[PDB]
Amino acid sequence: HHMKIFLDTANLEEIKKGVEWGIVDGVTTNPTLISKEGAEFKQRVKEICDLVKGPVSAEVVSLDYEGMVREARELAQISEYVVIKIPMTPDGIKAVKTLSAEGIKTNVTLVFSPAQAILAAKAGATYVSPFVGRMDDLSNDGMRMLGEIVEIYNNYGFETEIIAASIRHPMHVVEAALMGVDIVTMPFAVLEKLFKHPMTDLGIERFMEDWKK
Amino acid sequence: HHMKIFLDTANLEEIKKGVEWGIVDGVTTNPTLAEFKQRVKEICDLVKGPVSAEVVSLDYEGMVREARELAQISEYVVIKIPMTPDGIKAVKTLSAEGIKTNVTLVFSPAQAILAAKAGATYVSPFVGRMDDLSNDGMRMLGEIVEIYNNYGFETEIIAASIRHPMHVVEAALMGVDIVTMPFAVLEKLFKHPMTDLGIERFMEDWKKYLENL
Amino acid sequence: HHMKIFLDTANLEEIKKGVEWGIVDGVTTNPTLISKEGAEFKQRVKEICDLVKGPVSAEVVSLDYEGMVREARELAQISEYVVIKIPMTPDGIKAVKTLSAEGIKTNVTLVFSPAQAILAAKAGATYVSPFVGRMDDLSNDGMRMLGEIVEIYNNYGFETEIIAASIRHPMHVVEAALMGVDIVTMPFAVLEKLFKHPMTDLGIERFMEDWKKYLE
Amino acid sequence: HMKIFLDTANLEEIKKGVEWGIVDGVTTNPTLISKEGAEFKQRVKEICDLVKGPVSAEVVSLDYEGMVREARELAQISEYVVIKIPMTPDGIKAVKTLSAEGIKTNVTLVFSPAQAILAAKAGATYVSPFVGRMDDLSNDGMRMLGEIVEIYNNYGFETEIIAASIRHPMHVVEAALMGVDIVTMPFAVLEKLFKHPMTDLGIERFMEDWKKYLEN
Amino acid sequence: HHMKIFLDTANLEEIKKGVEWGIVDGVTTNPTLISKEGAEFKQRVKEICDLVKGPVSAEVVSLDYEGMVREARELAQISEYVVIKIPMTPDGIKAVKTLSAEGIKTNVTLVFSPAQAILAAKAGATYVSPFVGRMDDLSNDGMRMLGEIVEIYNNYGFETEIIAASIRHPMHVVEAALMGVDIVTMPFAVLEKLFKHPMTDLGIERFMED
Amino acid sequence: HHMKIFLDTANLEEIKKGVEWGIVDGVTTNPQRVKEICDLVKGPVSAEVVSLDYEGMVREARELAQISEYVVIKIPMTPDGIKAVKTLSAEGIKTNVTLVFSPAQAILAAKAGATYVSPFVGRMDDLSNDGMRMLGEIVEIYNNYGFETEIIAASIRHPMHVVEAALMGVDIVTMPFAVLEKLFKHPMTDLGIERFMEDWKKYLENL
Amino acid sequence: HMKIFLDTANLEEIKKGVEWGIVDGVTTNPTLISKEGAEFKQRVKEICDLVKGPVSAEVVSLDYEGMVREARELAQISEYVVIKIPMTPDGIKAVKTLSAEGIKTNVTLVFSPAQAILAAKAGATYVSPFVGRMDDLSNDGMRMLGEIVEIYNNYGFETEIIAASIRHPMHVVEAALMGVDIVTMPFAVLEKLFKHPMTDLGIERFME
Amino acid sequence: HHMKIFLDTANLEEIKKGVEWGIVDGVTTNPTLISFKQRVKEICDLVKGPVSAEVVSLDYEGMVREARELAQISEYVVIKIPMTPDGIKAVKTLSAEGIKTNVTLVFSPAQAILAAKAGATYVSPFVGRMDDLSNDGMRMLGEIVEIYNNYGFETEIIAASIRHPMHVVEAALMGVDIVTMPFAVLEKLFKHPMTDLGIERFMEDWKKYLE
Amino acid sequence: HHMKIFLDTANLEEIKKGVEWGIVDGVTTNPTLISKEGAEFKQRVKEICDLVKGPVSAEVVSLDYEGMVREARELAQISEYVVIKIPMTPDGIKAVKTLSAEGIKTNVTLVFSPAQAILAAKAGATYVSPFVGRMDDLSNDGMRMLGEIVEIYNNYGFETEIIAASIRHPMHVVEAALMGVDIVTMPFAVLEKLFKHPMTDLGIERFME
């Protein structure tokens, strides 16, 4: 029932730091994010799985149903932790139906509406990833759409878990936690911020000043 | 349990598409949607879930007579009964014989309570038609959801006369059991311009990651 | 639950329709109603019990404690379904304490406040009957008083069941259902109204032309 | 000030209404007049002379030409005559025409806020949403009325809202609480508004206190 | 427009105390209260008027329209401050319409519903007196009925002023004030209570202690 | 303060129909005839420009404005469009900023001096991102600051859009004729008319 | 619009307050006046001269006649002097009298909205509800203040509300959020209002 | 699931009075109030409930080393860990070894989530210190309580930096697990002037009864 | 009564584009920003003033009262549009009192609490600048803190205007607008985002025949 924190990264030092802290439960990874890093796609996913020992989402290349399913099966054989990122499309939903029936975990991504979220859950997705920050930047309120998806999923007890994605800043995390999102996936830089508070630092000096005297 | 989506259709490709997606749970039908009993059998074998089919007669005896005949087509067949005194009398009789019913042409919460008390398997409030009167069909649906939550009537609510995506989202936010919709509306539920942009971007990026070698 | 619907009637044809629809659970009665049907009191209470096979509330003549109890015992003998209507008075509450201990069901009637309703439950009444329409006519809001009684009975889980009474029109029934009242008792004329909607009629005209088109 | 009109053609009840200083106008129809043994116009004149406030009267025709024709002839009876026009396309056309000629209109048979907006935009003097008839469909007529009041407040349409199809005291109180301009009701409803059992008891008690004051 | 406080009394010492404090704006009266002072009705009403120099509500004997009007005119002659108490009935409302037209001030009393309060206002009452505490005792909530009347009167700006009547205790006063009733009429005993708080007394001992 | 109804049309019979009823205040158009419409409605008639560059938009706007005092120039919500609104406002040329899907866009439209903004409700609804909520945010912000810009609820698809827009107090709703026709209608009205005729019949039998 | 008074008799803290342009008056007690090293009347005068705004000062007597007598005496010190009157029947009588003479009053020791109504009807210039002292009883002083604000708004009493018995910044903020006319607070609380750790970090950063 | 009250104290007389009343369930300490090992032991023996005690070191290795030393004093000892990256690392380690932890210096709900995820026994948000910044400490506490209800973190919330009675009441009204307070504030909670007057009066009635 | 938009910048091209659009009303600056353009402090402030012809907030070097006032008077001479940024400190507040009395406009900056904002208004600040984004990052909700300030300033009609500052993204702007803040100051990058919507683009292509 604990809130899960995933990292949006392929950087292994930051994932080690996350697990050191006992705060990071998985990783979401990407074309873009592996574009940032430039190592072996399958290799990098295996390394990450070994490190976090929790859900690692990895995207498929193909966009047609047959190719998505083919590649999903391939990626799934890397590790029991691998979760397949599927884009929210009709073929992607078809793929989730097929892959869920063979025990392959899926993460439906690029979700921007509660309607899409419903479909993802009904198709049997393991996770859904609504993109909060990208909606917020349209000024159409991504936290509100996240709240509608939570509400709907609470109404029906869909087994699908919600990953609040496109998380940009600490308030995203706090508001997600206040509405009771299952998982928040965030950049390491955002995670680092969550530790910090200027009153904490003053409190600590109100210790350290003393022992000089 | 899960929110159910039925299709308002008799088109078998649409239904096939629906089941391929793993998102369509049943079908609601009418004559206008080519031989009646056959089309119903074909649809039953395809969806393998509740298929609502309407009777010709409006007198109690005729409704019951015809319901029994339609019920023989398939275990999946649900008999559509119009909200009338005789229709309610026919629901009492049919429920006692294990024949599934869907009370239709419901435009008030009062009608909905009689339907449930008579033993209807489903009730179908007509949202869109009320909306067009400017008397708010979604509010009337919400009243029916509220009443049925109050008493735990076994009857399930099918939000009907669904015209657009916001009907489906609002119905889901109030926790309606089932929403029955045209296939065209279903198709819209998959779609978002931010999804399409995200797909273009993930490709552009991946293809630049691959272009690196 | 299931929300229950009782009929305020002594007419057997109306009750027969009510049970033919599978929608009427019981009947609330009074001497006037029965009297109006050319029926004797006990036969007609009996006739009604046999027909509805569900709670049939019937009033006693006496207002003193001893007489109420005596007559309640006599009426209870008519049928297992008979529920004794007791007016909300000190003596009537006393009578409910006594009758409840003997397994005789009671319906405390003439309730116009939540305070009265608490006493009826605490005495062990099977039912309480707040008079909504009558309070409405005083412009003191009967639905609001009904909502307060439902809220109190939800807080404490009194076994006593609430019969929305003095129901005049369909919104009374809908508002009562929306608050979750246990039972609404209504005239048959009100029940008939509940079936009806203009859009249902137009839908039926339409699905008939759709069918006549299709045969083609 | 909230206005009260009477749904009646009875002159005694209108005289009482004016004696009490609480009736501002009257809404009529041919059946009320017929019930009184009266020819239509005449009974409208009689009522105008008595209430000396807005008296709503219907026309026979439903086509735009005939409505306008007849409206003009009715309007000549008295400065107080307000022409009832059914909410239709032709009726709305007639309102535009008649408002431009200084003839007052009451758009009747309104059952939705969309209808109400059209009536106001056409320039209706009054709009009459039918609360009780909606209530009986269990679609909540008071909520519909509230939506119209809300919209009318948003835009300050000159059109005044007459809460119509009023059946009981709570209708009036609820319409007052939302601030409708006018409530038109049957006399029987008006009579109920005066009444309360605690007022009666207060008067019994007040007579006892004078009686005792005097004795000492 | 300040909230007004009227006293339910005929006792002149209580009223003098009330005016000494600059808190009492008027008086509502009845034969019982007067009787209990050992006083005649019309005389006592005059003495109260002279003392409070504000609205003094006084009841008429008759219940028929003609007798109520006759008597109201006689009582009105006592003083410019006299307000005629009229029970809420059809004939009472008829009388208000008549008396309003003659410049005679009226206070419609025995009001137990918002419907009654509407008619009182429409007939032209100077004041309406909803009976809060007696409704409260029926457990049908007199404060809620008062708030309904306040709401309705705000919606239409009736000139009629609301006197929260049948006031029993300080919370009646405070709740009536929070909803913004025009006037509260209360027993002196209730007014005395309003001054009081144990922390005030403790504060006074402490800025005596030092 | 009256709510305005514009028609989404170029059909002159439906516009005559609308003005006959005294319920249509203007017209919004899309893909010469603009003059005919102006003459008929004698109220704001929004017409789009071809160009998308600032220079071209302004050039064309000036040309269209000369057809009639009633002409309002449709400008798409873009940087160049906003620049064009600045310029045209200064010259007394009325503008209607269209393709608005966020409150952020509407603020800029108002600040640049748009006569009207047109939020697209129905199109947002179909994204299941709630177009009526977006409109309500724009109404709220415009009430906070009293922008002189008036809000045209656009992309209106059905009666409830109109009723909800009214309940929020939008300045103007622009709708298809088909929607406007629906607004007149109710089954209880029809029944009451049938009943009304029955009572005149009765009334006649009885003397 | 919001006024800030200081609960003090210390002239350096009052000077700081006026230097900052944020202190509008002073509320006093002989405890503070003697705590400095001065006499009732003198320091009241010195404070008036310094703050040039309302300076509330308490009387010794509790009987009506003595309260009025002393109030007149104190009022002669400066046009700024406002007389503190305890919320009692005699105190309310005194307010009626002194209002009529143009002498300003501050009804103090108010713990209920009923008391506040009487204070306003008697013609008090100010009322001072004791927030923190109620808070300590766990009966919620800020709620009782909120009720008085709400009632004064309802009726537009000319009497102004001084939130008193203020002990910490959140009292000030909550008072401001409800729109109290005036908050009177100790100097120590005022000093806190300036402060935030993010401000200090901002200063290290920007000025760097 | 009673609300717990802890005492911010090292004074044993106050603690004794607290356990005599049957109201005090534990104690939160610091070296200040201590005028280290033996007193913590004396307090543990007296309260027989959770006794929070802080470590000297701020690096992860030193924190963990000292926590294990303190933990051997008594089963009741809970180790105070400041909300830092190393502190949270320490919590993970110590939780795994069955050593109880109290994450302190919490000023945001973000911090509070990390503490619960790390497996802290308790978290101590500093209400009063935030209140004094005028950023509303009770609101931040409410946010943490709502979050911990959403997810059912086993971590319990200790409302800390409690300065007055309304802090206690508002923390109770939001359903915080535990409130740690100074004795002085505890003393205040007993008191009300209407109680005192009721007792004066009840006496008066006895002496009248004895008529 | 219009909502004002200021730019957080010293870049003149961005300010020109802002004024071209007729949506930028002023500028808030710092020497970080101006150095990144490679420019002298006062000359850049003057250039900006000429360009926006609206309020241009500029920070002083000193933190003691005397120096702040001294420098403020010097900056104020540059242009009628110059507004002096003063950090929320006791001396800063002292300086606001003094400078207000001389008709020199002030912007109290580094505000993180409503208490701070009341003192700023009472001392006579022209503007107050609450730092939303930095509070947000502490997870203490900067929008809520801004809302409290707006509410307080509405309660009392302080003449001081609120500049929502530390604005990082489009929802900051929309939520500040929904609360009715007087002014939002934002980076150009955020202003650019405000124009944009994918449905606007698609609508354009649908007429791009």
Short mmCIF file of N, CA, C and O in Angstrom, two decimals, chain H residues 31-65:
data_model
loop_
_atom_site.label_atom_id
_atom_site.label_comp_id
_atom_site.label_asym_id
_atom_site.label_seq_id
_atom_site.Cartn_x
_atom_site.Cartn_y
_atom_site.Cartn_z
N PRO H 31 20.22 16.47 24.60
CA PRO H 31 21.24 16.72 25.64
C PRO H 31 20.94 17.94 26.54
O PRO H 31 21.30 17.93 27.73
N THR H 32 20.31 18.97 25.98
CA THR H 32 19.97 20.18 26.74
C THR H 32 19.23 19.81 28.01
O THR H 32 19.73 20.10 29.14
N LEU H 33 18.06 19.17 27.78
CA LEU H 33 17.06 18.78 28.78
C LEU H 33 17.68 17.81 29.74
O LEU H 33 17.38 17.81 30.94
N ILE H 34 18.56 16.97 29.21
CA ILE H 34 19.40 16.14 30.07
C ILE H 34 20.20 16.87 31.19
O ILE H 34 20.77 16.17 32.01
N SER H 35 20.25 18.22 31.25
CA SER H 35 20.86 18.91 32.44
C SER H 35 20.24 20.32 32.75
O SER H 35 19.13 20.58 32.05
N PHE H 36 23.96 11.37 29.52
CA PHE H 36 23.45 10.98 28.21
C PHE H 36 22.89 9.55 28.26
O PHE H 36 21.68 9.33 28.07
N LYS H 37 23.78 8.59 28.52
CA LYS H 37 23.44 7.17 28.58
C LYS H 37 22.50 6.87 29.74
O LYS H 37 21.41 6.35 29.56
N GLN H 38 22.93 7.21 30.95
CA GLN H 38 22.30 6.68 32.17
C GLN H 38 20.91 7.28 32.40
O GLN H 38 19.98 6.60 32.86
N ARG H 39 20.79 8.56 32.08
CA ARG H 39 19.52 9.22 32.22
C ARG H 39 18.52 8.63 31.23
O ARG H 39 17.38 8.34 31.60
N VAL H 40 18.95 8.47 29.97
CA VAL H 40 18.12 7.80 28.98
C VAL H 40 17.62 6.49 29.57
O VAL H 40 16.45 6.12 29.41
N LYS H 41 18.52 5.78 30.27
CA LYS H 41 18.15 4.54 30.95
C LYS H 41 17.12 4.80 32.07
O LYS H 41 16.15 4.05 32.20
N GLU H 42 17.34 5.84 32.88
CA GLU H 42 16.40 6.16 33.98
C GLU H 42 15.03 6.53 33.43
O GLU H 42 14.00 6.12 33.98
N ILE H 43 15.00 7.27 32.32
CA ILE H 43 13.74 7.61 31.70
C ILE H 43 13.01 6.37 31.14
O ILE H 43 11.78 6.25 31.26
N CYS H 44 13.75 5.49 30.48
CA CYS H 44 13.19 4.25 29.93
C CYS H 44 12.51 3.43 31.02
O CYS H 44 11.37 2.98 30.85
N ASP H 45 13.23 3.25 32.13
CA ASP H 45 12.70 2.52 33.29
C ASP H 45 11.45 3.17 33.87
O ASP H 45 10.57 2.47 34.35
N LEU H 46 11.38 4.50 33.81
CA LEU H 46 10.26 5.22 34.39
C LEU H 46 9.01 5.22 33.49
O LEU H 46 7.92 4.86 33.95
N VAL H 47 9.16 5.59 32.23
CA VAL H 47 8.02 5.67 31.31
C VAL H 47 7.62 4.32 30.76
O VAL H 47 6.46 4.11 30.46
N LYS H 48 8.58 3.41 30.62
CA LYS H 48 8.32 2.10 30.01
C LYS H 48 7.53 2.26 28.70
O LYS H 48 6.48 1.65 28.50
N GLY H 49 8.06 3.10 27.83
CA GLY H 49 7.50 3.37 26.53
C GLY H 49 8.61 4.02 25.72
O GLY H 49 9.72 4.21 26.25
N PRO H 50 8.32 4.37 24.47
CA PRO H 50 9.33 4.90 23.56
C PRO H 50 10.05 6.13 24.12
O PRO H 50 9.39 7.08 24.54
N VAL H 51 11.38 6.08 24.15
CA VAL H 51 12.21 7.20 24.58
C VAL H 51 13.18 7.58 23.46
O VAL H 51 14.15 6.87 23.18
N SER H 52 12.90 8.70 22.79
CA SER H 52 13.72 9.13 21.66
C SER H 52 14.97 9.80 22.17
O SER H 52 14.88 10.60 23.10
N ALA H 53 16.11 9.44 21.59
CA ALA H 53 17.40 9.98 21.99
C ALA H 53 18.33 10.18 20.77
O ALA H 53 18.42 9.29 19.90
N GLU H 54 18.98 11.34 20.70
CA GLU H 54 19.69 11.72 19.47
C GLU H 54 21.14 11.27 19.54
O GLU H 54 21.75 11.12 20.61
N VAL H 55 21.68 11.01 18.34
CA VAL H 55 23.09 10.65 18.17
C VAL H 55 23.90 11.90 17.93
O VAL H 55 23.37 12.95 17.53
N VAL H 56 25.20 11.79 18.18
CA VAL H 56 26.12 12.91 17.97
C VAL H 56 26.46 13.06 16.48
O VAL H 56 26.40 14.16 15.95
N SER H 57 26.84 11.97 15.82
CA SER H 57 27.41 12.05 14.48
C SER H 57 26.40 12.36 13.41
O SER H 57 25.18 12.14 13.58
N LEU H 58 26.88 12.93 12.31
CA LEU H 58 26.01 13.29 11.17
C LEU H 58 26.33 12.49 9.89
O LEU H 58 25.54 12.46 8.94
N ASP H 59 27.48 11.83 9.88
CA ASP H 59 27.79 10.94 8.77
C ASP H 59 27.08 9.62 9.01
O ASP H 59 26.81 9.24 10.14
N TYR H 60 26.80 8.93 7.92
CA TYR H 60 26.07 7.68 7.96
C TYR H 60 26.75 6.62 8.86
O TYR H 60 26.12 6.09 9.74
N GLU H 61 28.06 6.39 8.68
CA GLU H 61 28.79 5.38 9.48
C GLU H 61 28.72 5.66 10.99
O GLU H 61 28.38 4.80 11.79
N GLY H 62 29.01 6.89 11.36
CA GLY H 62 28.93 7.30 12.76
C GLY H 62 27.52 7.27 13.36
O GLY H 62 27.35 6.89 14.51
N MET H 63 26.52 7.65 12.57
CA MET H 63 25.15 7.60 13.05
C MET H 63 24.77 6.17 13.40
O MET H 63 24.22 5.90 14.46
N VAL H 64 25.07 5.25 12.49
CA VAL H 64 24.71 3.85 12.63
C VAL H 64 25.48 3.21 13.81
O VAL H 64 24.88 2.52 14.66
N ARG H 65 26.78 3.47 13.88
CA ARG H 65 27.61 3.04 15.02
C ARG H 65 27.01 3.47 16.37
O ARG H 65 26.88 2.66 17.30
#
